[PDB]
Amino acid sequence: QKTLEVWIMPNSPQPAEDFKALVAPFEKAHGVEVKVTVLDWGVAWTKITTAATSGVGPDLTQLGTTWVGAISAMGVLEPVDDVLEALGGEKAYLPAVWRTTRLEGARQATAVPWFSELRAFYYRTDALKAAGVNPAEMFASWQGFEAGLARLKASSFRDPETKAPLAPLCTPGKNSWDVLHNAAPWIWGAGGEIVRQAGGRWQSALNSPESLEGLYFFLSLAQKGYVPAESLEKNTAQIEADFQAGKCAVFASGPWMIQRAQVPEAKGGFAERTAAKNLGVAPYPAGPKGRYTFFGGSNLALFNFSKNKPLAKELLKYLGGPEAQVRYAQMTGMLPALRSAWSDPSFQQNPLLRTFIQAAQFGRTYPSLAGWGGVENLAVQHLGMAWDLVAQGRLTREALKDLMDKASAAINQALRHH
Amino acid sequence: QKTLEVWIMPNSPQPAEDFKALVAPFEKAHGVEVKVTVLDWGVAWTKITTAATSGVGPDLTQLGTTWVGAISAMGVLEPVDDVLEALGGEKAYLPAVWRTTRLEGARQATAVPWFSELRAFYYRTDALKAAGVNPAEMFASWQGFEAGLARLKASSFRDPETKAPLAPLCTPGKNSWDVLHNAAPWIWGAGGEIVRQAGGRWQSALNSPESLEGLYFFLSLAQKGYVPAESLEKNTAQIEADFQAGKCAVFASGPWMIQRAQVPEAKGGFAERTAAKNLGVAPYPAGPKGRYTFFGGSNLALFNFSKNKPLAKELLKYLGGPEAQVRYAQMTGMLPALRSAWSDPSFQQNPLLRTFIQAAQFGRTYPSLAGWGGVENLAVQHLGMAWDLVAQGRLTREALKDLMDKASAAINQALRHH
Ligand SMILES: OC[C@H]1O[C@@H](O[C@H]2[C@H](O)[C@@H](O)[C@@H](O)O[C@@H]2CO)[C@H](O)[C@@H](O)[C@@H]1O
Ligand SMILES: OC[C@H]1O[C@@H](O[C@H]2[C@H](O)[C@@H](O)[C@@H](O)O[C@@H]2CO)[C@H](O)[C@@H](O)[C@@H]1O
Ligand SMILES: O=S([O-])[O-]
Ligand SMILES: [Cl-]
Ligand SMILES: [Cl-]
Ligand SMILES: [Cl-]
């Protein structure tokens, strides 16, 4: 009759149902009830920070890897070094994954790695073929990326269901954390970054010459008509929905879309759509200073005001452990956080998934900072205003610089305090 | 083993679960399993129009009242006059609800009323009291509304959980259908409208002198600092989340927030929050040409490519009928569509809900037109750009007029399209 409450984000298309089937064996072996509540990504920051400040909430909460340091810095998370030792310690994890178990420079781990994700480009094989585009040259370089989009815009190809052209590229301009995650590769590729350590402190680098170069190149794809105006007002889920509906030739996303492509519309997938029958993946192109993609995922954290700490730690060890690592990655189409589970043969057979796995050497993420929640909110707000400059025909290098100088002022405030 | 597929939007905090409990009796009596799929509002237009164009989808779909004419005019909906006759016909419905059963001027009804919904202002009793605001004066007139917001801005009141001031008003500036529904009362209150019958056709009126007056007054609340810049990039979900979290003194919503306030976070509500303990409702203020609010909701439609039409009509008769009408309104915090069901004490004994029932006198909606889905997408896009003028310090009457001239040209295209 002993019970646990868990907060999760929508990691699969039937998230509560998938999470319940995942924990059913643990419920049987301990004779306990695990309750699950689903928080949309757009409101999860608001709801998790309120639970933290109020001292009331669940036993466990999913945390995006980029939030672990920001929640940890509030002093509301129970140490989980014991759980991670029981899962095989530092050596069981990719160094980049291990760094998401804590606030940078904290002694104690405060989250357990649950799943990994990184970004690549999904494209329509039938569209790039009709346009005469070589996917290998389109996704090899900025120049190539731009040339491929120009061909996709000039193409007379029409989706056989919609009977209408495809937008060359769709990217979300509003409301998602992905307004930051989708700009990051371009910034990094130009030799830029989101933040930089100097003058003793962390500050915004979104106004560095190289950051402006990468961000401007990204924004100018919309300026040139490769991204439709409508896309700049939309969020992640809508861009996913536009691709599934046969309206976009190319978009940036995570390994989950592969799982969706294999499942019917009734189960929140798109197996019956033209796009699922014509699905390609290519990595992010090399920029002038490097080849990068966003690498992230989600960890599980235990609030220090939980009344069932020993039982919730047993559940973290279960979810962080090999068997649940494999089953949840299968249900979600995410990559296991436990490095050993990448080698499970169920992940070796899928050709599109292999593209994601082998793209991981280009994966980069943000330092695990106390101000990071604020940085992401302000980044989403200010980058969405840069997309606005395009919708208005007002995008210039000076206007972008002025806007990123204001984003930088505000981000510097957030890195001092909450 | 007979099957039905039903598409619904997230009407309650656990939508699929609540919908399965609602249809359980019908499943038992008929030996059918009803499969439900949840479509977020932001992607429902995309997924419903793709089902229409492809001839592949569910048996039934939820349709927002403002979309019924638009989907009907695509030639894909079954007539349901038999179901509405069996539910008691034109007399069993509010005239405004009856008009949402069809495309304007069509012989045959193509949707069954499911639930009703109209807009009012939620406010924080504790905030208006600390600010010295008389709710009765604040929600009586535009001048009153503005005077109350000036007092809310000046207040040194801090939310007891956040330890921080409350924004006087939050409204979503992006990527919700509510960007239109939140503007419409201000437009209508100035004596404007969204569209106007102009010489044998329908056309945009967003660029009429009175429509600009109403919209300009609305936007200028944000110009004066009554709405934070942050709010202008956010969608309806985030604004609701911000109110629940104690960040907003006032916001416009539906009757569902009353149900949400009575349910804990773990079931998708906000009973733990200060805002649930300090909840007031007031009507939209009278504009200079009178008092108006947005009156809508959702109906249920049967695709004419369904293979299960006789059974799906029995399910429509069930969902539209007295018992299920009461149950779903209880679970969702919506008003029943069937007038007779308003008599249940769950509605008539609910003092916050009584403000929504009384607000129904002043309820207005859009004509039931062929291009209406297009009108809403384009309206949301262009109204999002009006909010942008504010964020940028570029709001002038000419700039707003130029923007609504472009919204009007685009909307005219969508209305004349065959
Ligand atoms: O910065 C927020 C976290 O985002 C996570 O990615 C989410 C994304 O935000 C959602 O929009 C959705 O599409 O799913 C993604 C995968 O769960 C990211 O994985 C985390 O590392 C970030 O902390
Ligand atoms: O315009 C589409 C329909 O909107 C309905 O209101 C929704 C709103 O769109 C959402 O943001 C959500 O919060 O809930 C509302 C109620 O379901 C409206 O009821 C319909 O009349 C519209 O057709
Ligand atoms: O901005 S254009 O779409 O009117
Ligand atoms: Cl960085
Ligand atoms: Cl939405
Ligand atoms: Cl109107």
Automatic annotation (TrEMBL), chains A, B:
<keyword id="KW-0732">Signal</keyword>
<keyword id="KW-0813">Transport</keyword>
<dbReference type="GO" id="GO:0042956">
    <property type="term" value="P:maltodextrin transmembrane transport"/>
</dbReference>
<feature type="disulfide bond">
    <location>
        <begin position="170"/>
        <end position="248"/>
    </location>
</feature>
<keyword id="KW-0614">Plasmid</keyword>
<dbReference type="InterPro" id="IPR006059">
    <property type="entry name" value="SBP"/>
</dbReference>
<dbReference type="GO" id="GO:0015768">
    <property type="term" value="P:maltose transport"/>
</dbReference>
<dbReference type="Pfam" id="PF13416">
    <property type="entry name" value="SBP_bac_8"/>
</dbReference>
<protein>
    <submittedName>
        <fullName>Sugar ABC transporter, periplasmic sugar-binding protein</fullName>
    </submittedName>
</protein>
<dbReference type="GO" id="GO:0055052">
    <property type="term" value="C:ATP-binding cassette (ABC) transporter complex, substrate-binding subunit-containing"/>
</dbReference>
<dbReference type="GO" id="GO:1901982">
    <property type="term" value="F:maltose binding"/>
</dbReference>
<comment type="similarity">
    <text>Belongs to the bacterial solute-binding protein 1 family.</text>
</comment>
